[PDB]
Amino acid sequence: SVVLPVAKRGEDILKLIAAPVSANELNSNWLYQLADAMHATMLERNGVGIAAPQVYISKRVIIVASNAVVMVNPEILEFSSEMCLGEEGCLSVPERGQVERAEMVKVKYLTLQGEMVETVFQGFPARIVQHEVDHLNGILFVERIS
Amino acid sequence: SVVLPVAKRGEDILKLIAAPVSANELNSNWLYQLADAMHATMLERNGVGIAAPQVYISKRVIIVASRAPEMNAVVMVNPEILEFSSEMCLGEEGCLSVRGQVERAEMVKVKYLTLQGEMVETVFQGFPARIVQHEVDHLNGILFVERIS
Numbered sequence: 001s002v003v004l005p006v007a008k009r010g011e012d013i014l015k016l017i018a019a020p021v022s023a024n025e026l027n028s029n030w031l032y033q034l035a036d037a038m039h040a041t042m043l044e045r046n047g048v049g050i051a052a053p054q055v056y057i058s059k060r061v062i063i064v065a066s067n068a069v070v071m072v073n074p075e076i077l078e079f080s081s082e083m084c085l086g087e088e089g090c091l092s093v094p095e096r097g098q099v100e101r102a103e104m105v106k107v108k109y110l111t112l113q114g115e116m117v118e119t120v121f122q123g124f125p126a127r128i129v130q131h132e133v134d135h136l137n138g139i140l141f142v143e144r145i146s
Numbered sequence: 147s148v149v150l151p152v153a154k155r156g157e158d159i160l161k162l163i164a165a166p167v168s169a170n171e172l173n174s175n176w177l178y179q180l181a182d183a184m185h186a187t188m189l190e191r192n193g194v195g196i197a198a199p200q201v202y203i204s205k206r207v208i209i210v211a212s213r214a215p216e217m218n219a220v221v222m223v224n225p226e227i228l229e230f231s232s233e234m235c236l237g238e239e240g241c242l243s244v245r246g247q248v249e250r251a252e253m254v255k256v257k258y259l260t261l262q263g264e265m266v267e268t269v270f271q272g273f274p275a276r277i278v279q280h281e282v283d284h285l286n287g288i289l290f291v292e293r294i295s
């Protein structure tokens with residue numbers, strides 16, 4: 001049910017490298033409750049994704065929802081050299097911007113139950129993925145512009 | 147219960163000022179679960195307290211659980227030390243995230259919220275007072291090794 005407070009540009013939490021979710025957390029009430037609160041917060045703000053650092057949780061959890069998918073410890077395995085520009089805004093940057101992304105990405109991640117999945121995204125979902133994974137590595141979208 | 151991974155000295159999560167728990171989070175399953183995982187992790191690491199930043203959660207939640215006197219564990223949300231005593235004690239401190247000597251106030255008066263969100267004000271003495279000072283230092287981005295003076 002909970003909507004979490006969101007960190008804004010300037011706050012140091014957003015510039016860290018987020019720590020991996022551990023094995024013990026997989027399939028826990030702990031992790032389901034985190035994911036649920038992140039999903040509620042994204043919904044309240046009209047987001048199509050969210051990353052844990054943005055709700056002060058320095059853990060590698062994102063949600064992508066252009067059904068909403070929860071990804072634990074995601075890794076982008078390859079980017080296409082084919083690029084595309086999209087307009088991005090960020091819940092943490094209250095300034096929107098035109099940003100180049102790989103048109104396609106191959107990604108590996110864990111579900112909340114801890115099952116390994118691998119998949120490709122194209123177009124907008126793929127931009128969402130790259131934006132959220134950027135949050136996990138301490139990067140805001142404005143740093144990908146200039 | 148879940149045992150969580152713990153940040154060690156030189157991870158920058160430990161150097162931030164942790165954000166206050168919001169009103170909407172009080173009395174939520176979210177918060178009960180966070181506190182439960184913190185509690186399990188402290189027990190499994192043989193600590194006598196824990197702060198949320200140590201488990202990568204940049205939020206103002208601590209647990210004080212001396213064993214040293216023995217007390218029942220207390221969870222404190224948005225804790226605030228309203229008064230430190232002029233009296234001081236010095237004793238060996240170590241941290242799940244790092245030992246040596248630290249001068250602490252011998253008494254502290256602390257105001258905090260329970261997990262339901264009830265306000266409580268309590269005076270700690272001796273070692274529990276040191277535990278509180280240490281955990282609140284974690285919330286403000288300070289490790290005890292910065293206090294070996």
Ligand SMILES: CCCCC[C@H](CC(=O)NO)C(=O)N[C@H](C(=O)N1CCC[C@H]1CO)C(C)C
Binds near residue numbers: 047050090127131
């Ligand atoms: C675009 C790449 C993904 C950005 C995801 C963000 C959410 C966020 O900050 N995640 O870290 C969002 O939903 N942003 C929205 C957004 O940019 N949207 C919403 C629909 C179209 C798209 C492009 O402007 C609004 C809320 C600013």
Ligand SMILES: CCCCC[C@H](CC(=O)NO)C(=O)N[C@H](C(=O)N1CCC[C@H]1CO)C(C)C
Binds near residue numbers: 194239273280
């Ligand atoms: C005022 C001291 C408070 C220290 C709290 C730490 C745990 C911690 O890092 N919390 O943020 C701890 O449990 N440290 C233990 C500790 O210092 N103990 C355990 C029993 C008594 C005392 C010995 O000095 C061990 C793990 C080294």
Ligand SMILES: [Zn+2]
Binds near residue numbers: 089090091131135
């Ligand atoms: Zn964002």
Ligand SMILES: [Zn+2]
Binds near residue numbers: 240241242243280284
């Ligand atoms: Zn400590």
